[PDB]
């Protein structure tokens, strides 16, 4: 419950800072001031228009790489087993497969953008 207390205190402190920020200063708002910033000129299109990702494949593969990182996390405890041969072979197998996937993506020009 101590971690919950710490989280609550941090969140409350941050929200109190927000409250003081939004209620201490003298506020004078008008349409021009709150307009979006586009380096002094009016924006052409909406900022909510599609924004193409030139590294989409990199992200989709980062998904599986994060999966492999999740698979590799139990390794510090896995070294405490009596079957060190099998454990080591399986860990090196997972790492080799990760390297092979990275190599396949690299050679087939997947890490490149556009």
């Amino acid at each position: 419950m101590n971690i919950m207390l710490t989280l609550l205190t941090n969140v409350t402190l941050a929200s109190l800072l927000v409250l003081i920020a939004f209620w201490l200063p003298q506020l004078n708002a008008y349409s021009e001031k709150t307009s979006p910033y586009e380096c002094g000129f009016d924006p052409m299109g909406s900022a909510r228009l599609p924004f193409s990702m030139k590294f989409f494949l990199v992200a989709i593969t980062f998904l599986l790489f994060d999966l492999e990182i999740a698979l590799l996390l139990p390794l510090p405890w896995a070294s405490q087993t009596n079957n060190l041969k099998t454990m080591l072979t399986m860990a090196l197998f997972l790492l080799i497969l990760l390297a092979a996937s990275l190599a396949y993506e690299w050679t087939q020009k997947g890490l490149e953008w556009a």
């Binding site: 708002a29 008008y30 349409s31 709150t34």
Partner: protein, 340 residues
């Protein structure tokens, strides 16, 4: 004695001979009165009791040396003397919608007007433009309108040839009428006495009021006349607020609040030492229906045709819309029903 021949083309660098002392120019109407005076090439003198920073927005309104800033004290006639000494026109716009610690409705709508009018006679000022309120009654439910009536008589006593203007409910970009209703969304619903079915209001555009004041100065017959500045349409309070929440694209939730409860709510918001969000007099004035005075000249007599609220309401309430309804035009919302 201070008579100036106009020169130029009426532009920014011209001479108009309209040297004026606009009291309370640091306010909604003041900005427009100064800007109209400044663009013609008039020597505008701006007294101020606030921090020079708050007067900064008035600086670009006139050419070099055409906008003079000098401090004044409402309780010191000597400070009034040095600011109206060389002015051929004096305009009084000093007025607060809420009683302060050191200034009460009597002090701002009776004492100061009288002091300005009295001193102006001493200095020889030719024309004075006093700004009262359409619903100024000696027995009005609101102290604000009560003092606004007492001061009106005192100005005529101190300054017999003074033009008195009684605007209805000026609306504009920095207004406390259209923005007032649009800001009620934060409190959930829209509390209206009798659901706003027993109040008729005739708001006036800020530009029309300012141009009326300028035309009153230019007009040689406005001396001693009492004008009433009103809009071209009369609206029910419920219909007007619904239209306000219509062009603002906000969910309109009107619930009837009894008069005693609404007055109690107004008292709660008076506690704030800063500018109150609402006041008991503010509640009474809003609920009070606008008077009709067909025996007084209006904007039409001064050559300015009143602009309908429908045309100039999008400007005020566009900032109150969300991102979804920012780019919507001013024609999608249909005009509200007018009681004409």
């Amino acid at each position: 004695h201070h008579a100036l021949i106009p020169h130029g083309k009426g532009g920014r660098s011209s001479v108009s001979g309209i040297v004026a002392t606009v009291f309370g120019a640091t306010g909604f109407l003041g900005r427009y009165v100064v800007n109209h005076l400044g663009r013609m090439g008039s020597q505008v003198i701006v007294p101020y009791r606030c921090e020079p920073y708050d007067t900064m927005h008035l600086r670009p309104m006139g050419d070099l040396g055409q906008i003079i800033f000098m401090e004044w004290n409402g309780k010191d006639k000597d400070s009034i003397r040095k600011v109206v000494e060389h002015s051929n026109v004096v305009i009084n716009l000093v007025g607060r919608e809420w009683e302060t610690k050191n200034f009460d409705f009597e002090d701002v709508f009776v004492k100061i007007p009288h002091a300005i009018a009295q001193v102006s006679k001493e200095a020889g000022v030719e024309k004075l433009i006093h700004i009262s309120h359409l619903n100024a009654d000696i027995k009005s439910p609101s102290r604000y309108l009560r003092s606004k009536a007492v001061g009106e008589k005192e100005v005529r006593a101190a300054f017999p040839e003074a033009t008195i203007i009684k605007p209805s409910d000026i609306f504009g970009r920095e207004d406390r009428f259209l923005n007032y209703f649009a800001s009620m969304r934060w409190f959930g619903g829209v509390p209206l006495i009798s659901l706003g079915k027993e109040t008729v209001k005739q708001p006036v555009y800020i530009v029309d009021v300012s141009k009326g004041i300028i035309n009153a100065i230019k007009d040689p017959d406005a001396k001693g006349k009492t004008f009433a500045f009103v809009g071209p349409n009369r609206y029910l309070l419920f219909d007007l607020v619904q239209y306000i929440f219509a062009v603002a694209y906000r969910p309109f939730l009107p619930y009837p609040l009894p008069h005693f409860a609404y007055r109690w709510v107004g008292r709660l918001f008076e506690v704030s030492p800063f500018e109150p969000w609402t006041t008991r007099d503010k509640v009474e004035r809003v609920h009070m229906s606008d008077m009709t005075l067909p025996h007084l000249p209006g904007l039409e007599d001064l050559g300015i045709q009143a602009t309908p609220l429908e045309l100039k309401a999008i400007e005020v309430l566009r900032r109150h819309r969300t991102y979804r309804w920012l780019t919507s035009e001013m024609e999608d919302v249909k005009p509200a029903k007018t009681v004409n």
